[PDB]
């Protein structure tokens, strides 16, 4: 970090967006990127992976998000 990575976000119907981001971005910031790139609103997005619900104010780096990582995208 700062270090550019990409993340893949898949929703339950199989729609996929791959987002370029930086390890210092927050989860809330990624969600803003996701939102813009999928026609939705950042505050209606939930990001998970298995048992982890990502908190908005934590950076990707502190969540140890790796390059290429697949995240689960949900709507609220």
């Amino acid at each position: 970090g700062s270090h550019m990575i990409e993340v893949v976000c898949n929703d339950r119907l199989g729609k996929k967006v791959r987002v370029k981001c930086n390890t210092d971005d927050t989860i809330g910031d990624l969600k803003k990127l996701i939102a813009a790139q999928t026609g939705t609103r950042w505050n209606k997005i939930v990001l998970k992976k298995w048992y982890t619900i990502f908190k908005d104010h934590v950076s990707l780096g502190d969540y140890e998000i790796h390059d290429g990582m697949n995240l689960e995208l949900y709507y609220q």
Partner: peptide, 19 residues
């Protein structure tokens, strides 16, 4: 997916720093 430069312009628009 968006290029680095297209991502950077979007980032700029959202108040985020460059990649």
């Amino acid at each position: 997916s968006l290029s680095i430069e297209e991502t950077n312009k979007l980032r700029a628009k959202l108040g985020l720093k460059p990649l």
